[PDB]
Symmetry: C3
Subunit: 390 residues, 3 copies
C-alpha cells in the first residue's frame, strides 16, 4: 500500500532518521571531527585514536573523551603488513542496552560499530563509496569507511601511518560536502616546448621562464580536494594529470595569456598583413588505464560515445606581444579517469606555429595561467546516458 | 510567547520533522526512486506502479514491494481523456492505525495519501510548486505532485503514458536538487546568416558548415534539467528558445570563436590599417507570451524595470581568420520566460558587417560554441525587487 | 567507547536533533521568516515584533500569532542609547513544562530563550558567528543573534530602528544559505582616469561617458548579500571596496571591454605595425584596517604568505577600437578584508598607455563591464593553510 514515513500516526525508526541525515550530508560519509591518530598512547600492542564524530551512511558515530586515551584498537598479531584501519557498521550484530531510563543508568554496548583492520580487497568489497546499507538493488548489512593506512613493522615496534584524507570532512567543503572545488591554483608562467602537442602542468610545478635564455622548474600553489581528485600516482604523468575519484559533471575554468606569441610579420610580400598562427587549448579525459583511483578501485566505465577532447580556446595569434584568453566549460568525468589540459599548435615556426625560436623569457610562454575545476552535478540514474557523454 | 521547537522539553511532531526534511530537500518535492509505471501489470481497469519513495513538502511517502504488482490505481470510468496521475497529500483525512506496538502488529491505513487522476486545472490549483501545506499566507490542506500524463482511449484499451520528469529527482542533481545545471551542450559550429540580428540555436540542432559552399542542419549533444527549463513548445521558436520553469538568478557561461570573420583589408586608402567590424553576442529574456511553462501554468511576473537584453560580448573583429570569446554573467529569470542568445552585427559587408559574403566553411560562422546555464540563487522575499530586475 | 547516535537502541536528544538541523542549515543561523518589527504596537515602554520562525545553531525558535501584538519586549529603563535587540539561547536556564499530554494541556515556559537588549561588546562575546553551543574547544552555554539596531531617544519617545539583514535569511539564498552570490551588478560603462593604477567602482556608481567631452556619475544596479559582504563604511573607499563578512574561497567573474583603446599607429617609422599598449585588470585584497566587518568585529587573520593582488587579465591593446575580455578566478578572502578591482597601465600616452588623451566618449573607457562574486568554499580546518594563501 501507500505508506507514510513521517505522518501523524507513523513511527520513526533509527533506519529512517539515518536515511534522513545521509540525505543532509549529500550522501557523503566521513569523519566530521577528530578521530585522528593519537601516537602518544600508541604502543606495539595497541593503536589509539582521539575523540570525535563521523557519519556513515546516515549513522552518527562517536568516540567520547574521558578520565585520553580516548579509544584503543588491538593490534596484537599484526606484523609486517600494510592494512587499513576502518570504521565499520555491521547491522547483523545486536546492540546491548543495560540499565534504565528513569534511573539515570541507560547505556549501550554498540556491537554494530567497530574499529578494525582490513586488507584492501576486503575494504573495497564493503566500502561505503561503492555499496550501501540503503541500496535499492544490492543492500548491504556491513559497510566500512577507511581512516588510515597502517603499516605494521616487526613485533615490538609501533606502526607507521597515513591518513586517508578523502574520508575526513576537514575543511574546504562543510556545507556542500559532495561537491565544490576539486582543484585550483595560483597564476603561474610556463614555457611552451617546441612540439605540436603538450600538456600544461596543473599539479603545482611549472617550467617558469626566468632569464632571456632559460626556464626553470618552480613550484606554484595548488590545492586539491582528495575526495574528488588526486595527482596521478605514475611519475611519468604526475606533473600533468589528475585522477578523478568521483563521477560527475565538472566545470573547468581557465584563464591566462600567451606571451611572445609568434606571427608572420607584415612584409610587402604578404601585402603588409599580420599572418596569425592557429593554436588551441583543450581539456582531455582518458580512461584507458584501470585502477588509478584510490585503493586501486575499479574505474567507472563511461557511456558509449563519451568525449575525450574538448576545445576550450581555439584562435589565431593576433600580432600582439601578449594575448589573453579565458574559457569555462562543463564536462563529464568518471572515477578512475585521467584529466589534463593540452596546448596544441603547428611546428613550423616560419609558417604555422604559435611559438617562436627563443628560450626562457625570449620564447613563447603561458603567463598568468590558472584554473579551477569544480564538481557541479552528479551522473546517477538517467543522467549517466543523457549528460555523461559530454 | 517564545516557543522552542527542538529544545529539551519540546515535543517533536510529524509536521515538525516534515518541515525539517523539506528544508533538507531545498524545498523541492519529488520522486526519489522508483514509482515508474509498471505496464506489465496494467490492464484497462487498472494502472500499476513500481515500488519506491517520494518526498512531498517534507512528507515521506512509500510504495512497498510484496508477494509485484507493487500498487494499483483504479481506472474504471476513465475514457477518451488526458488526465494527470498525481500523488496527493490530504491532511483533512484521518490515518487509521490498527493493532499494537508490543505486539508486532501496529499498522496504518494512510488515508492522507492517495494516488488519483486529476485534470490540469485541478492539479494546478493544488500543485506543490505553487502552494504549500506550510505556506505563511495561504496554507493548504491538500497538495499534489503530478507523475504522468495518462491519455485514456476506448473502454477496453490500456492507456498511453508520458512521465513528468520534472517531478522525479532522477539524476543530474542529488545533492542540490533545487539548483545546479539547467542546460548545457557540447561544442558546435553554426553558420551566421546574413542578417543584423539572429538567435543562436541552443536546443541541439545547428546549421553546421560542411563544405566550401554549404551548411547543414546537424544534431549536437545538449542536456536540460526539466525542473528548471524546457525547449520552447512552439515550433517557430523551438530551435532557439528555452522556457524557464523556475524563478531564479542564473549564471550563463558562453565560449566559442568567430571564424572567417570579416574586416576591411589594409589598402593604401585607409593608411594600411585593419578596419574592424563591430559585433555583439547578447542574452535575452522575453515574457510577452503567457502559459509557456509546464502544464500551461501562469507565468511569474517580473518586477517593474526588469532587463530584457544583456551584452555578453561586445567588440570589433581584429583582422584574424579566427577570434575567440568567452563570457560569464548572472541574470534574473522568471517562470514562463523565454531565454535565448543572439548574434548582432551590421549588414553592409564592405563597411560594417562582421560577416562576409561566403557560404558553408567559406562564410563567417561560430565555431567551437558552447554554453552552460545554471541556477545559482533564488528570488524569494526582498531579492525579487533588489536582485530580480537584472 | 564507540557510541552510536542514531542506531536502533540509541536515545535521540534535543541536542542531537539540533546538531542535525544546524548541519542542514550549512551552520548558518538566522530568521527564516517574520520577526520584523511591528511599529504599530510599539510604545515608549515596549517594542513589538511580528510572529515568525528562526533557527539558532540548530534550535528552532517561534514567535506565535494570537488573539497581534505577536510579542512584546520591555524597553522601560532604556534611554539615549543605541543597543542591539537580540534573540538569545541560554542553556543554563530551565524550561518549565506544565500540564499533561493525554490531557491536551502540555505547555512550556521556555526560559532558555529570550529577547533582550545588549550592547555591542556583549553581543560580540556571545555572537553565534564567532562562538557555538556545539564548539569543540570552547563550547558555550549562551549564544545570541542580533536582529535590530535600536536607538533609544528621550523617555516618552518611541525608538528608531535598523534591521540587521545579515541575520535574516530573506531571499537570495534559501537552499544554500551559507554560500551563493556575494555581489553582482548589471553592465556599466566607466571612464578610465589618466593614472597608472585606479580602482573600478563596483558598488553601484560609475563615471559614465555621456558626451564627446564629459562623463558623469551614474547609478547602476548592484546587489550584495549582507551575510557575505558590504560596501566599505569609509566614504573614501565606499565607491570601490567591499568588506568581506565571511571567510571563504570565492569565485570572481568579470567581463567587459576596453573601448577607444590606445595603440601606436602604423607609421613607416615602425615598419607599418600596430604598437600595442600593456594593461591589466587585477583583483586585490587588503587586511591592513581592522574592525571593518559588521559590528566592528575583529578581522580574521589570514595565513602567513597570503596573496594580495592577482592578475585576472593581462594583455596588449590590439589596434581595434574595442576589445573584449573575460576572466574567472577563485581566491581566498577573510572576514574584515577589503576586496576591490584595479585597472593598471602606463601613463605615457604616446608610448606605453592603454588610455588616450580624450574625455567622455572620446576617451578610453570600460564598456559593458560587470562582475559576480560568489562564495564557493570554506576555510575551516586544514584548508585555512592549504587553500587560504591564494
Ligand atoms: C594505459 C595507459 O597508461 N595509458 C596512458 C596513455 O593513454 P593511451 O590511451 O594508452 O595513449 O596516455 C594518457 C595521457 O596522454 C594517460 O592518461 C593514460 O593513462
Ligand atoms: C507573444 C509572443 O509569442 N511573443 C514572442 C515574440 O516576442 P514579442 O515581445 O511579442 O516580440 O518573440 C520572442 C522571441 O523574439 C518570443 O520570446 C515571444 O514569446
Ligand atoms: C589602514 C587603512 O585604512 N588602509 C587602507 C589602505 O591600505 P594600506 O595597506 O594601508 O595602503 O588602502 C586600501 C585600498 O588601497 C584599503 O583597503 C585599506 O583599508
Amino acid at each position: 500500500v501507500l505508506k507514510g514515513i513521517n505522518f501523524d500516526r507513523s513511527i520513526v525508526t533509527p533506519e529512517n532518521e539515518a536515511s534522513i541525515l545521509d540525505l543532509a550530508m549529500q550522501n557523503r560519509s566521513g569523519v566530521l571531527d577528530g578521530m585522528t591518530i593519537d601516537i602518544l598512547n600508541t604502543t606495539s600492542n595497541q593503536l589509539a585514536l582521539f575523540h570525535g564524530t563521523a557519519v556513515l551512511q546516515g549513522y552518527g558515530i562517536e568516540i567520547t573523551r574521558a578520565a585520553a586515551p580516548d579509544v584503543l584498537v588491538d593490534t596484537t598479531g599484526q606484523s609486517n603488513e600494510t592494512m587499513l584501519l576502518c570504521l565499520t557498521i555491521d547491522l547483523n550484530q545486536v546492540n546491548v542496552p543495560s540499565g534504565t531510563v528513569g534511573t539515570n543508568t541507560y547505556a549501550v554496548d554498540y556491537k554494530q560499530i567497530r574499529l578494525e583492520f582490513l586488507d584492501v580487497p576486503t575494504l573495497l568489497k564493503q566500502y561505503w563509496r561503492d555499496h550501501s546499507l540503503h541500496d535499492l538493488i544490492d543492500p548491504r548489512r556491513v559497510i566500512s569507511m577507511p581512516l588510515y593506512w597502517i603499516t605494521f613493522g616487526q613485533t615490538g615496534t609501533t606502526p607507521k601511518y597515513e591518513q586517508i584524507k578523502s574520508n575526513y570532512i576537514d575543511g574546504g567543503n562543510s556545507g556542500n560536502p559532495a561537491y565544490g572545488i576539486a582543484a585550483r591554483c595560483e597564476n603561474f608562467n610556463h614555457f611552451i616546448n617546441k612540439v605540436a602537442v603538450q600538456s600544461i602542468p596543473i599539479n603545482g610545478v611549472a617550467n617558469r621562464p626566468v632569464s632571456s635564455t632559460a626556464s626553470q622548474l618552480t613550484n606554484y600553489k595548488v590545492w586539491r580536494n582528495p575526495y574528488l581528485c588526486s595527482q596521478d600516482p605514475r611519475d611519468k604523468f604526475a606533473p600533468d594529470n589528475l585522477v578523478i575519484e568521483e563521477d560527475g559533471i565538472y566545470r573547468i575554468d581557465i584563464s591566462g595569456s600567451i606571451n611572445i606569441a609568434n606571427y608572420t610579420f607584415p612584409a610587402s610580400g604578404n601585402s603588409w598583413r599580420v599572418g596569425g598562427r592557429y593554436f588551441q587549448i583543450v581539456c582531455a579525459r582518458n580512461s584507458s588505464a584501470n585502477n588509478l583511483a584510490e585503493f586501486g578501485a575499479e574505474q567507472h566505465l563511461p557511456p558509449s560515445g563519451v568525449w575525450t577532447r574538448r576545445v576550450l580556446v581555439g584562435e589565431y595569434t593576433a600580432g600582439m606581444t601578449e594575448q589573453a584568453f579565458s574559457s569555462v566549460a562543463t564536462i563529464s568525468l568518471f572515477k578512475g579517469d585521467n584529466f589534463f589540459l593540452q596546448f596544441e599548435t603547428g611546428t613550423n615556426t616560419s609558417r604555422d606555429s604559435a611559438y617562436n625560436n627563443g628560450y626562457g623569457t625570449s620564447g613563447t610562454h603561458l603567463r598568468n595561467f590558472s584554473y579551477t575545476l569544480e564538481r557541479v552535478g552528479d551522473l546517477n540514474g538517467t543522467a549517466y546516458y543523457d549528460n555523461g557523454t559530454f
